[PDB]
Design a protein around this ligand. Structure first.
Ligand SMILES: [Mg+2]
Ligand SMILES: [Mg+2]
Ligand SMILES: [Mg+2]
Ligand SMILES: [Mg+2]
Ligand SMILES: [Mg+2]
Length: 170
RNA sequence: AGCACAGUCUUAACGAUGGAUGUCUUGGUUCCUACAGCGAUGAAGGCCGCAGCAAAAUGCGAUACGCAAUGAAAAUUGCAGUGACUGAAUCAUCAGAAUGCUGAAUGUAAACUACACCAAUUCCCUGGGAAUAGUGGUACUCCUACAGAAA
């Protein structure tokens, strides 16, 4: 994992190797999640899956609509990336399980590192124009998630000068 | 429990993506040396097969990843199985045996496993007794010899 941890005893990690979900949506979801208690994050994910709360598309915001729920994050654009959300939820669950297996309280766990890297594209073919074959590739991803339990010089002359200054002030 | 606006750009650390560089290398490369034809005794090429579990390549040919014989010589192994305590397991060598169907392909054919005709053919035992629709042969040109006809 990418993060500098020091003590892995208070941390619980979870990974997703090559996910069949779009890199951008998933990234957005991750961003939305970040710096949150694990349970709260899970709840948020659930809500998004049921189309109650949206994730704000702030980075990859090209063409994404203009939802009502985006006002919650001071933004205008937002979406409900279902499959991606589900994937993320699964990973969260895994992380939770891992934590349980150790000795970490799930209530005091915060997501300290939610990384989404883009995996190698799954190549497919699309057919265009005047007999033209074009790449119809997917954008798979790796997801890395880390949860964590959260609760000169003197100089004599210089000294003299300082003293003088003090005296002056007085 | 709080707190960072967000985005865009930049820097550093740590990662992804990619396969550059470095290091290798049972390949190539050129040069040198040496030998140097295979085929109607059926070649090269091409099909079809062939393993217990078997696709390709490799190897081989209905004895089919090999038979015999020679020289080594205890293993072979994924499993199954087979052997040693030396013609046997495995290599190497290869001279003997064998070498499907084709292909110059040569009985006539060919998008045929089509079809003729002449031999019936083959094996066993020391003249009989068994077999199989199976095996041979039959092209065109030519040469030498023979044959009997023609002028
Ligand atoms: Mg900012
Ligand atoms: Mg032998
Ligand atoms: Mg021997
Ligand atoms: Mg013929
Ligand atoms: Mg015909």
């Amino acid at each position: 994992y990418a993060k500098k941890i020091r003590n892995l005893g208070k941390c619980a990690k979870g990974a997703g190797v090559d996910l069949r979900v779009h890199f951008k949506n998933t990234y957005e979801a991750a961003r939305a999640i970040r710096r949150m208690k694990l349970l709260e994050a899970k709840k948020y994910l659930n809500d998004v899956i049921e189309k109650k709360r949206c994730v704000p598309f702030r980075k990859y915001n090209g063409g994404v609509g203009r939802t009502n729920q985006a006002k919650e994050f001071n933004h205008t654009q937002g979406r409900w990336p279902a499959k991606s959300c589900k994937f993320l939820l699964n990973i969260l669950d895994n992380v939770q399980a891992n934590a349980e297996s150790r000795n970490l309280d799930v209530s005091k766990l915060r997501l300290i590192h939610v990384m989404v890297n883009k995996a190698r594209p799954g190549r497919r073919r699309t057919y265009k124009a005047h007999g033209r074959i074009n790449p119809f590739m997917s954008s798979p991803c790796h997801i890395q998630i880390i949860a964590r339990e959260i609760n000169i010089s003197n100089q004599n002359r210089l000294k003299n000068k300082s003293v003088k200054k003090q005296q002056t002030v007085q």
